């Protein structure tokens, strides 16, 4: 075990350091909570931190790691926002005791060798045109789960397809961790918080309310059925200046090879200028 | 509740959750959990892994018996052998219990899996590493035991453990051999007398190579080839000298010589440590 100062933020870069500290905490009865992030923290991330915090006896580990493996080449990785000083300041303000900030060399010392191959869900929606993205996510999350060995791991409903795929990972590899989904944090007007929102200029920011407005319109229209819900969403998106829809799909909640019934998830992705935004919402069909 | 466990007796569990719960409970009581993965049909080769696991102070030995459909049966007899060895846990899951959602998330091995045995069987090691990762997470052993017999499998499991940051020690156990050197395998019984006599060439070629190695890598390889060449009906699939991690052989130093061959319809493998010079 390296130094651990309780009630203070401890920052570890070495996998072995955080693994030792986590083990030592776990052996003395603390329950270790893990919150994977790519940094540039905002209130969406803090909702996961707080959910973790409220677990009785919890120690909270927030990982910050802009994982190269889930980026496709073409400057996306270099372009990802990095604000380490603000991130650690926020974690201190939240009472988090552990930040895990690994280097690329420590996570990938052998490059890409053994990796996780996700199931067919990874080839759809976000994965359609980024066929390796979710292998990247599931590989790093598996590694983080093995390094930290948390009792529970926290993921946002914001990245709902990611959340579902993490549940598949946990189920399919018999991982002894509880996956906790945390509801999407929104701005006052409905805009889902994201580190990419900083790339919307004033006009795009105004137009971007249409994604959440479309989804919530759809959620309410859904008493009248799937077609009514989808066409409500399309009408709002269509009314929105310079929103280019990539997809809008209503699926069963597991997003799996199962047709939609009473409970679904409506998912949208759209481009505003160069910024790709995502949102999703629970949908109940024929239910008021 | 935790499932029943009778110390000193063979306790058999088919449900992953059950062996998981028992393993956890035992870990907490001051046992070190040892895992020995098999596909049943046990012989002295498997028993050497068992005995290596047993000798670890405070060990409780978990032997898994599971025929993994993804890398492609004497149940009562296997179980009696384990009882005889003083094994306390056998984990005998069904395919449905191991794969309740079918094949979905899997492990994708690195490029070593496309080589050597990955030649004729390109999907084989994905199946192995997928099932071994699952057994590791179910049982959560302190140490997991594999035979040097399947050396490429062993090296790939070390890669799995390293790459996924798994907290388990991987223990390789030396190949158990018949009196004439042939590596023990359930496949040996398929050989007719001519083929069984010819089959001694694999181990003879490797051991010759090991001793020829004082004269350098080429002398070792040529020695092995000459012994394989003295045997009838032995179709060599490969004969390769690699470093101990199965990368390219270094100029001198330690390596591994691996061989595979087909005798009629039966495919046999063997391998040996080589020290160059
Ligand atoms: N607005 C939000 N509400 C809830 N969770 C979020 C939000 N934005 C990001 N997250 C979650 O925080 C984790 C890290 O997000 P990221 O750093 O963007 O990869 C993921 O589990 C996200 O789903
Ligand atoms: N002759 C042998 N000597 C040492 N280990 C062996 C031998 N035969 C099989 N094993 C090991 O026993 C384990 C189970 O093999 P199997 O049941 O063939 O999957 C593997 O780790 C094998 O490498």
XYZ file of C-alpha atoms and ligand atoms in Angstrom:
611
model
C 0.000 0.000 0.000
C 1.232 3.557 -0.881
C -0.020 6.541 1.159
C -3.729 6.802 1.741
C -4.943 10.009 3.462
C -8.576 9.523 4.556
C -11.024 12.411 4.067
C -8.689 13.882 1.425
C -8.296 13.341 -2.295
C -5.615 10.762 -3.025
C -4.482 10.684 -6.722
C -2.895 7.479 -8.028
C -1.557 6.924 -11.471
C -0.104 3.408 -11.059
C -2.609 0.524 -11.446
C -0.711 -1.378 -8.695
C -1.060 1.577 -6.290
C -4.821 1.895 -6.635
C -5.249 -1.903 -6.613
C -3.336 -2.172 -3.307
C -5.212 0.671 -1.678
C -8.560 -0.686 -2.914
C -7.743 -4.171 -1.509
C -6.656 -2.714 1.805
C -9.930 -0.736 2.050
C -12.058 -3.693 1.052
C -10.280 -5.942 3.680
C -11.216 -3.467 6.409
C -14.890 -3.402 5.540
C -15.236 -0.313 3.324
C -17.262 -0.853 0.111
C -15.373 0.360 -2.865
C -17.438 2.310 -5.466
C -16.059 2.885 -8.963
C -17.050 5.766 -11.265
C -15.326 5.516 -14.728
C -14.937 8.822 -16.549
C -12.958 10.444 -19.300
C -12.606 13.628 -17.259
C -13.681 17.166 -18.226
C -16.104 16.680 -15.338
C -19.527 18.330 -15.162
C -22.698 17.896 -13.040
C -23.638 14.752 -14.997
C -20.472 13.068 -13.716
C -21.162 14.465 -10.252
C -24.554 12.741 -10.103
C -22.668 9.410 -10.441
C -20.153 10.529 -7.786
C -22.975 11.443 -5.402
C -24.847 8.167 -6.058
C -21.622 6.320 -5.213
C -21.103 8.531 -2.155
C -24.427 7.780 -0.622
C -23.691 4.035 -0.452
C -23.200 3.460 3.313
C -19.525 2.723 4.190
C -18.502 3.670 0.618
C -15.072 4.728 -0.527
C -15.349 6.389 -3.932
C -12.869 5.801 -6.732
C -13.292 8.054 -9.742
C -11.193 6.985 -12.681
C -10.146 9.590 -15.209
C -8.716 8.195 -18.427
C -9.230 9.350 -22.010
C -9.076 5.788 -23.308
C -7.342 5.710 -26.749
C -8.755 2.314 -27.625
C -12.354 3.586 -27.907
C -11.358 6.351 -30.316
C -11.135 5.839 -34.050
C -8.176 7.634 -35.665
C -8.746 11.084 -37.282
C -8.012 13.435 -34.370
C -10.968 12.597 -32.146
C -8.539 11.493 -29.400
C -6.376 14.632 -29.605
C -9.533 16.780 -29.731
C -11.109 15.284 -26.559
C -11.298 18.036 -23.858
C -8.863 17.795 -20.992
C -9.238 19.950 -17.843
C -7.319 17.985 -15.147
C -7.090 20.859 -12.655
C -10.793 21.639 -12.681
C -11.518 17.828 -12.523
C -9.476 17.284 -9.324
C -10.946 20.491 -7.774
C -14.462 19.172 -8.354
C -13.545 15.806 -6.847
C -12.118 17.498 -3.761
C -15.329 19.571 -3.447
C -17.366 16.389 -3.596
C -15.461 14.604 -0.762
C -14.071 11.894 -3.088
C -11.145 10.128 -1.608
C -9.563 8.456 -4.621
C -8.888 9.647 -8.149
C -7.337 6.979 -10.406
C -5.532 8.698 -13.352
C -3.577 5.986 -15.223
C -1.192 6.685 -18.090
C -1.619 5.124 -21.515
C 1.597 3.111 -21.092
C 0.402 1.676 -17.759
C -2.980 0.547 -19.290
C -1.632 -0.621 -22.656
C 1.965 -1.724 -22.064
C 1.580 -4.397 -24.736
C -0.487 -2.324 -27.177
C -3.682 -4.039 -28.295
C -3.230 -7.741 -27.511
C -6.019 -9.586 -25.576
C -9.220 -7.531 -25.979
C -12.932 -7.819 -25.302
C -15.152 -8.638 -28.250
C -18.666 -7.265 -27.450
C -21.822 -9.014 -28.800
C -23.783 -7.824 -31.856
C -25.251 -4.813 -30.002
C -21.809 -3.137 -30.421
C -22.261 -3.013 -34.258
C -25.461 -0.932 -34.042
C -26.538 2.634 -33.185
C -23.235 4.322 -32.013
C -21.235 1.289 -33.199
C -22.594 1.197 -36.758
C -19.946 3.529 -38.189
C -17.478 3.026 -35.316
C -17.238 -0.721 -35.325
C -14.391 -0.830 -32.758
C -15.639 1.792 -30.353
C -17.410 -0.573 -27.871
C -14.583 -3.189 -27.896
C -12.451 -0.181 -26.689
C -15.004 0.691 -23.956
C -15.546 -2.889 -22.761
C -11.795 -3.613 -22.755
C -10.948 -0.597 -20.608
C -13.900 -1.149 -18.280
C -13.008 -4.769 -17.758
C -9.442 -3.670 -16.855
C -10.662 -0.949 -14.499
C -12.991 -3.467 -12.776
C -10.069 -5.874 -12.329
C -7.647 -3.193 -11.069
C -10.098 -1.565 -8.625
C -12.413 -4.559 -7.833
C -15.310 -2.352 -6.760
C -18.499 -3.664 -5.166
C -20.500 -1.427 -7.463
C -19.719 0.445 -10.692
C -21.712 3.522 -11.754
C -22.696 4.368 -15.364
C -24.989 7.145 -16.713
C -28.201 6.441 -18.553
C -26.904 9.256 -20.784
C -24.813 6.650 -22.600
C -27.574 4.100 -22.509
C -26.145 1.758 -25.171
C -22.845 1.760 -23.244
C -24.738 0.987 -19.989
C -26.530 -1.984 -21.588
C -23.228 -3.265 -22.967
C -21.610 -3.002 -19.575
C -24.452 -5.120 -18.126
C -23.760 -7.673 -20.873
C -20.037 -7.629 -20.038
C -20.775 -8.204 -16.322
C -23.307 -10.973 -16.980
C -21.313 -12.766 -19.725
C -17.952 -12.783 -17.896
C -19.568 -13.631 -14.446
C -18.134 -10.422 -12.912
C -18.895 -10.028 -9.197
C -19.869 -6.318 -9.361
C -23.287 -4.538 -9.300
C -23.848 -2.168 -12.242
C -25.767 0.957 -11.153
C -27.410 3.049 -13.837
C -27.757 6.738 -12.919
C -30.458 8.975 -14.531
C -29.431 11.560 -17.068
C -28.547 15.011 -15.714
C -29.983 17.890 -17.786
C -29.581 21.657 -18.096
C -32.615 23.805 -17.119
C -34.044 23.572 -20.631
C -33.618 19.775 -20.967
C -30.204 19.623 -22.750
C -28.434 16.388 -21.547
C -25.139 17.483 -19.950
C -22.040 16.342 -21.839
C -18.350 17.346 -22.083
C -19.021 17.986 -25.783
C -21.668 20.667 -25.169
C -18.807 23.221 -24.933
C -18.521 22.871 -28.769
C -21.956 24.374 -29.404
C -21.891 28.033 -30.288
C -24.828 30.191 -29.028
C -27.091 29.322 -31.946
C -26.333 25.597 -31.838
C -26.874 25.660 -28.078
C -30.343 27.134 -28.666
C -31.177 24.586 -31.386
C -29.881 21.642 -29.323
C -32.860 21.788 -26.910
C -34.740 19.991 -29.705
C -33.260 16.600 -28.859
C -34.655 16.490 -25.308
C -37.853 18.291 -26.445
C -38.341 15.610 -29.145
C -37.783 12.774 -26.690
C -40.069 14.129 -24.020
C -42.740 14.920 -26.617
C -42.410 11.308 -27.807
C -42.640 9.965 -24.218
C -45.977 11.707 -23.847
C -47.273 10.937 -27.368
C -46.598 7.218 -26.721
C -50.100 6.699 -25.145
C -51.197 6.764 -28.790
C -48.577 4.156 -29.851
C -45.099 3.826 -31.347
C -45.847 5.566 -34.648
C -47.340 8.604 -32.789
C -44.266 8.727 -30.482
C -41.770 8.543 -33.352
C -43.605 11.088 -35.530
C -43.887 13.537 -32.526
C -40.089 13.313 -32.109
C -39.483 13.730 -35.836
C -41.697 16.805 -36.003
C -39.708 18.558 -33.241
C -36.363 17.555 -34.804
C -37.551 18.736 -38.224
C -38.556 22.119 -36.779
C -35.005 22.600 -35.463
C -32.581 24.772 -37.421
C -29.371 22.940 -38.353
C -29.930 19.716 -36.455
C -28.848 16.816 -38.660
C -30.321 13.552 -37.332
C -28.036 10.546 -37.559
C -30.604 8.104 -36.011
C -33.848 8.098 -34.004
C -34.879 4.622 -32.884
C -37.290 3.084 -30.502
C -36.105 -0.177 -29.081
C -36.808 -2.659 -26.385
C -35.034 -1.601 -23.169
C -32.289 -4.207 -23.528
C -31.696 -2.886 -27.111
C -31.254 -6.642 -27.856
C -32.812 -9.035 -30.418
C -36.260 -8.591 -28.798
C -39.104 -6.524 -30.349
C -40.446 -3.457 -28.532
C -43.379 -4.141 -26.186
C -44.801 -1.932 -23.403
C -41.337 -0.660 -22.218
C -38.859 0.860 -24.585
C -36.062 3.313 -24.997
C -36.116 6.048 -27.563
C -32.572 6.972 -28.691
C -31.413 9.822 -30.843
C -28.048 11.069 -32.191
C -27.734 14.295 -34.171
C -25.017 16.629 -35.496
C -25.027 20.312 -34.743
C -22.130 21.684 -36.840
C -19.301 19.251 -36.074
C -20.670 18.338 -32.631
C -22.416 14.980 -32.317
C -25.005 14.936 -29.500
C -26.806 11.961 -28.013
C -29.892 11.621 -25.842
C -32.362 8.895 -24.898
C -35.455 8.440 -22.749
C -37.661 5.775 -21.249
C -40.816 5.185 -23.302
C -43.950 3.270 -22.219
C -46.253 2.356 -25.082
C -50.035 2.779 -24.489
C -49.350 3.973 -20.928
C -50.364 7.397 -19.433
C -27.364 -18.622 2.823
C -24.068 -20.191 1.674
C -24.441 -23.717 0.100
C -23.321 -26.668 2.223
C -19.621 -27.590 2.276
C -18.247 -30.790 3.867
C -14.527 -30.416 4.645
C -12.470 -33.496 3.698
C -15.076 -34.813 1.268
C -15.658 -34.180 -2.455
C -18.324 -31.459 -2.702
C -19.928 -31.269 -6.147
C -21.585 -28.083 -7.476
C -23.154 -27.486 -10.873
C -24.446 -23.922 -10.398
C -21.825 -21.186 -10.876
C -23.438 -19.087 -8.128
C -23.049 -21.933 -5.647
C -19.359 -22.646 -6.255
C -18.829 -18.853 -6.241
C -20.532 -18.502 -2.826
C -18.616 -21.501 -1.391
C -15.300 -20.227 -2.759
C -15.889 -16.759 -1.254
C -16.918 -18.271 2.119
C -13.837 -20.563 2.140
C -11.446 -17.684 1.170
C -12.764 -15.746 4.181
C -12.162 -18.752 6.491
C -8.439 -18.833 5.692
C -8.245 -21.189 2.719
C -6.320 -20.413 -0.477
C -8.516 -21.427 -3.426
C -6.743 -23.333 -6.191
C -8.432 -23.824 -9.548
C -7.660 -26.645 -11.958
C -9.626 -26.342 -15.227
C -10.301 -29.570 -17.145
C -12.629 -31.130 -19.668
C -12.965 -34.377 -17.704
C -11.715 -37.785 -18.885
C -9.012 -37.347 -16.276
C -5.651 -39.130 -16.316
C -2.285 -38.844 -14.539
C -1.546 -35.626 -16.488
C -4.540 -33.947 -14.804
C -3.651 -35.513 -11.429
C -0.227 -33.778 -11.528
C -2.043 -30.451 -11.715
C -4.258 -31.584 -8.847
C -1.230 -32.568 -6.717
C 0.557 -29.309 -7.417
C -2.551 -27.443 -6.226
C -2.913 -29.627 -3.141
C 0.558 -28.993 -1.851
C -0.029 -25.207 -1.455
C -0.440 -24.721 2.377
C -4.132 -24.055 3.230
C -5.253 -24.998 -0.299
C -8.762 -25.973 -1.162
C -8.749 -27.459 -4.619
C -11.441 -26.643 -7.136
C -11.447 -28.890 -10.196
C -13.713 -27.711 -12.990
C -15.008 -30.267 -15.442
C -16.608 -28.562 -18.413
C -16.513 -29.498 -22.074
C -16.448 -26.085 -23.650
C -18.414 -26.099 -26.937
C -16.687 -22.782 -27.876
C -13.157 -24.249 -28.161
C -14.361 -26.968 -30.618
C -17.062 -38.088 -20.965
C -16.627 -40.175 -17.788
C -18.386 -38.094 -15.057
C -18.659 -40.667 -12.240
C -15.210 -42.022 -12.975
C -13.640 -38.520 -12.947
C -15.343 -37.798 -9.656
C -14.000 -41.028 -8.097
C -10.461 -40.053 -9.155
C -10.856 -36.619 -7.536
C -12.226 -38.242 -4.331
C -9.137 -40.513 -4.337
C -6.892 -37.393 -4.632
C -8.604 -35.665 -1.721
C -10.059 -32.874 -3.853
C -12.807 -31.044 -1.941
C -14.648 -29.257 -4.777
C -15.716 -30.300 -8.262
C -17.508 -27.697 -10.381
C -19.523 -29.444 -13.109
C -21.668 -26.775 -14.894
C -23.959 -27.345 -17.906
C -23.413 -25.485 -21.136
C -26.643 -23.537 -20.451
C -25.392 -22.423 -17.008
C -22.037 -21.261 -18.414
C -23.756 -19.648 -21.412
C -27.285 -18.587 -20.287
C -27.345 -15.854 -22.905
C -25.512 -17.820 -25.591
C -22.334 -16.486 -27.198
C -22.417 -12.739 -26.712
C -19.425 -10.910 -25.117
C -16.250 -12.966 -25.713
C -12.485 -12.649 -25.398
C -10.463 -11.833 -28.503
C -6.922 -13.188 -28.072
C -3.868 -11.400 -29.476
C -2.127 -12.537 -32.737
C -0.407 -15.481 -31.034
C -3.812 -17.225 -31.169
C -3.663 -17.277 -35.020
C -0.340 -19.122 -34.944
C 0.741 -22.731 -34.359
C -2.416 -24.539 -33.064
C -4.390 -21.485 -34.321
C -3.496 -22.632 -37.863
C -5.999 -25.476 -38.253
C -8.203 -24.060 -35.436
C -8.472 -20.266 -35.779
C -11.334 -19.854 -33.245
C -9.998 -22.287 -30.681
C -8.174 -19.987 -28.291
C -10.964 -17.363 -28.251
C -13.080 -20.206 -26.892
C -10.418 -21.190 -24.327
C -9.694 -17.645 -23.013
C -13.466 -16.882 -22.891
C -14.162 -19.953 -20.796
C -11.044 -19.500 -18.603
C -11.863 -15.831 -17.874
C -15.409 -16.967 -16.782
C -14.044 -19.728 -14.537
C -11.637 -17.227 -13.031
C -14.409 -14.772 -12.203
C -16.776 -17.464 -10.880
C -14.247 -19.248 -8.610
C -11.838 -16.288 -7.908
C -8.861 -18.533 -7.156
C -5.525 -17.426 -5.710
C -3.754 -19.627 -8.242
C -4.863 -21.400 -11.409
C -3.021 -24.433 -12.773
C -2.341 -25.334 -16.425
C -0.185 -28.106 -17.985
C 2.946 -27.185 -19.969
C 1.569 -29.886 -22.328
C -0.580 -27.157 -23.868
C 2.189 -24.610 -23.868
C 0.631 -22.172 -26.316
C -2.596 -22.276 -24.270
C -0.510 -21.567 -21.124
C 1.247 -18.570 -22.713
C -2.102 -17.201 -23.972
C -3.550 -17.488 -20.443
C -0.560 -15.551 -19.066
C -1.370 -12.901 -21.754
C -5.050 -12.872 -20.673
C -4.037 -12.392 -17.004
C -1.524 -9.647 -17.775
C -3.740 -7.774 -20.310
C -6.875 -7.807 -18.249
C -5.032 -7.064 -14.956
C -6.395 -10.245 -13.339
C -5.337 -10.879 -9.767
C -4.455 -14.602 -10.018
C -1.106 -16.434 -10.207
C -0.846 -18.736 -13.250
C 1.067 -21.910 -12.448
C 2.417 -24.073 -15.262
C 2.875 -27.738 -14.412
C 5.434 -29.882 -16.325
C 4.189 -32.485 -18.842
C 3.467 -35.908 -17.431
C 4.868 -38.603 -19.803
C 4.456 -42.342 -20.375
C 7.550 -44.513 -19.731
C 8.950 -43.960 -23.181
C 8.444 -40.142 -23.096
C 5.158 -39.791 -25.000
C 3.204 -36.925 -23.500
C 0.108 -38.277 -21.725
C -3.127 -37.523 -23.524
C -6.550 -39.116 -23.845
C -5.815 -39.156 -27.597
C -2.980 -41.688 -27.226
C -5.488 -44.537 -27.083
C -6.619 -43.892 -30.603
C -3.179 -44.932 -31.894
C -2.704 -48.349 -33.352
C 0.509 -50.223 -32.390
C 2.558 -48.922 -35.380
C 1.406 -45.384 -34.706
C 2.038 -45.670 -30.972
C 5.618 -46.824 -31.672
C 6.053 -43.971 -34.217
C 4.592 -41.427 -31.727
C 7.669 -41.757 -29.467
C 9.448 -39.658 -32.162
C 7.848 -36.389 -30.938
C 9.315 -36.578 -27.442
C 12.553 -38.176 -28.719
C 12.999 -35.326 -31.267
C 12.441 -32.654 -28.586
C 14.796 -34.191 -26.044
C 17.459 -34.766 -28.713
C 17.026 -31.064 -29.651
C 17.374 -29.935 -26.020
C 20.775 -31.678 -25.789
C 21.881 -30.739 -29.323
C 21.310 -27.061 -28.338
C 24.853 -26.693 -26.951
C 25.859 -26.558 -30.621
C 23.301 -23.763 -31.362
C 19.731 -23.293 -32.645
C 20.191 -24.796 -36.079
C 21.836 -27.937 -34.653
C 18.857 -28.324 -32.266
C 16.316 -27.938 -35.046
C 18.154 -30.279 -37.381
C 18.489 -32.905 -34.630
C 14.700 -32.749 -33.991
C 13.940 -32.961 -37.688
C 16.208 -35.945 -38.109
C 14.392 -37.899 -35.367
C 10.920 -36.996 -36.831
C 12.339 -38.100 -40.239
C 13.170 -41.569 -38.808
C 9.481 -42.277 -38.018
C 6.909 -43.635 -40.521
C 3.372 -42.151 -40.842
C 4.142 -39.037 -38.807
C 2.915 -35.929 -40.740
C 4.577 -32.961 -39.123
C 2.313 -29.892 -39.026
C 4.969 -27.666 -37.471
C 8.285 -27.726 -35.678
C 9.143 -24.273 -34.341
C 11.754 -22.819 -32.014
C 10.443 -19.661 -30.267
C 11.286 -17.637 -27.164
C 9.534 -18.693 -23.950
C 6.733 -16.103 -24.634
C 6.335 -17.641 -28.168
C 7.808 -14.600 -29.880
C 10.798 -15.031 -32.254
C 13.757 -16.945 -30.806
C 16.585 -14.687 -29.505
C 20.171 -15.343 -30.708
C 21.018 -17.410 -27.623
C 19.147 -17.770 -24.294
C 15.978 -19.652 -23.350
C 13.344 -20.781 -25.730
C 10.726 -23.391 -26.374
C 10.622 -25.979 -29.184
C 7.073 -27.025 -30.141
C 5.956 -29.769 -32.432
C 2.620 -31.038 -33.799
C 1.945 -33.980 -36.054
C -0.809 -36.125 -37.443
C -0.681 -39.908 -37.122
C -3.567 -41.257 -39.206
C -6.487 -39.160 -37.873
C -4.968 -38.404 -34.451
C -3.186 -35.096 -33.851
C -0.449 -35.087 -31.184
C 1.504 -32.166 -29.683
C 4.577 -31.816 -27.543
C 7.034 -29.104 -26.535
C 10.228 -28.646 -24.477
C 12.395 -25.959 -22.876
C 15.513 -25.266 -24.945
C 18.591 -23.355 -23.738
C 20.613 -22.106 -26.681
C 24.384 -22.617 -26.258
N -25.563 14.158 -18.303
C -25.219 12.997 -17.698
N -26.041 12.373 -16.803
C -25.741 11.183 -16.231
N -24.578 10.544 -16.488
C -23.672 11.083 -17.358
C -23.942 12.359 -18.033
N -22.892 12.633 -18.845
C -21.981 11.627 -18.676
N -22.459 10.711 -17.789
C -21.855 9.440 -17.368
O -20.567 9.560 -16.757
C -19.699 8.511 -17.204
C -18.467 9.127 -17.869
O -18.900 9.867 -19.017
P -17.776 10.306 -20.088
O -16.668 10.873 -19.222
O -18.493 11.299 -20.963
O -17.370 9.064 -20.834
C -20.523 7.681 -18.195
O -21.061 6.643 -17.405
C -21.646 8.620 -18.610
O -22.866 7.976 -19.029
N 0.347 -35.043 -19.933
C 0.020 -33.903 -19.280
N 0.897 -33.295 -18.434
C 0.592 -32.120 -17.811
N -0.585 -31.514 -17.952
C -1.557 -32.036 -18.757
C -1.309 -33.291 -19.477
N -2.409 -33.551 -20.215
C -3.310 -32.544 -19.954
N -2.781 -31.651 -19.081
C -3.374 -30.402 -18.575
O -4.637 -30.625 -17.977
C -5.468 -29.489 -18.244
C -6.793 -29.996 -18.777
O -6.590 -30.514 -20.076
P -7.966 -30.877 -20.827
O -8.850 -31.673 -19.808
O -7.341 -31.684 -21.972
O -8.533 -29.522 -21.069
C -4.708 -28.587 -19.227
O -4.111 -27.555 -18.435
C -3.676 -29.536 -19.786
O -2.560 -28.866 -20.349
